[PDB]
Design a protein around this ligand. Sequence first.
Ligand code: NA
Length: 490
Amino acid sequence: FSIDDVAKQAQSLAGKGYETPKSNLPSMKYADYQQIQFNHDKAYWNNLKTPFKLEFYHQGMYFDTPVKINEVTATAVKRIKYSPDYFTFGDVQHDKDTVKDLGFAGFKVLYPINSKDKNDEIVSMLGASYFRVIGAGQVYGLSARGLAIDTALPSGEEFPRFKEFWIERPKPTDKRLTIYALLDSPRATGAYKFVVMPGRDTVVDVQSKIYLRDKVGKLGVAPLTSMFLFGPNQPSPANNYRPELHDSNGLSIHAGNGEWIWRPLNNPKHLAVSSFSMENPQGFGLLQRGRDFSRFEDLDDRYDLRPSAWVTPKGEWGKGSVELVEIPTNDETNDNIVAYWTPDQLPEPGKEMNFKYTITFSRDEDKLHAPDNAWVQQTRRSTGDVKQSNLIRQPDGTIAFVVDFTGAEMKKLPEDTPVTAQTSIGDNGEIVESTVRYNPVTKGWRLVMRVKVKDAKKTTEMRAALVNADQTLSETWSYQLPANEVEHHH
Ligand code: NA
């Protein structure tokens, strides 16, 4: 069994009219749902000699369609049948006749990633083509997807879904788990081979074969979905003991031409789409830079322990854009950040597309960056004059940003190193002041940029990179001041 077996099924589906899935759920309040729990004593492979274990999700609410799950042993492909016996329901029905047409909603993978005597979750595959992944000592944060379609387009995003999985039984000695997945969507289908490698960083190897059943406005490859409520770049308007609240705070990109770009995330008042056009992207990911607990202070959610996800393409992906979508949100309950690679041109429907890449879920951001290129540790917004601290100061139309850089090589540079800053700003803004100074506390350099906005109702974009005389010392801080962000009222 290989990806070809799945691809064959994908190609077939792509050559026929799309079959809209039909709900198979009978009569549910969320409270009741939370009562349906998987009997940990029923973990798949709990009887096998293998560190990996499987658990399943039960249908209910908006998980109104099932996914088929098969196990791939050395000699056979066995369909893992759904049974209410895998779960405990307590208060809910679950009659062997009321759950007759039910199947699994999704599945999770367990592994002793933290300690030998505990099978902790490391992967969760549930809903559309979404899945969550974590490394050692981490807590669930951002999600990845098998594919994204027409995201942020006025015509409406199309959400493909994984309808079937093939999980091969690992040898007792295996440290990796292979998962195959069949993806179906109104205008697209696909075949995936996932290879999950748990560790300090849990790395997922991805190979896919996508087929368009019909042309689409936008194809999102290797998508990531996260959440950003507020942070020092745009602090919470309402009092909150939490200084920050987010699963990611920036989009990191290693451009086709070698430049490193860092786009701090926002929670704009209006839908924001940012496109970084390039050819052959070397890498991109939604990162969580700054993991000291004091940035978050939340003991229940532990944002400080949530993974950064870095996508590394295998091969040349050609012309397209690493796109960032920021959605207005008032709550941390719904993800508002999306990132992906979207190709400029697509081949004719039915034509096969091959994408190979790895997704690294890590807490070692410094290791997800080139050592000889400084990165932005944090971005702090402040009123125009950074020297001023008066509490009743009236807006003077100007705004400032304190951007702190640090890095392996930078930490060694001498204090008196004449570090300069190459800046730039869009037509809607003007750079009033731009200074760089050494930070003896961090052993890095601090940039203070003050800019004035011409029209607060329009978007304002600026860029800055630390340079030396002989070279470029840091990634390019690429910031966007959302429209209506610095507007005063009432
Ligand atoms: Na602190």
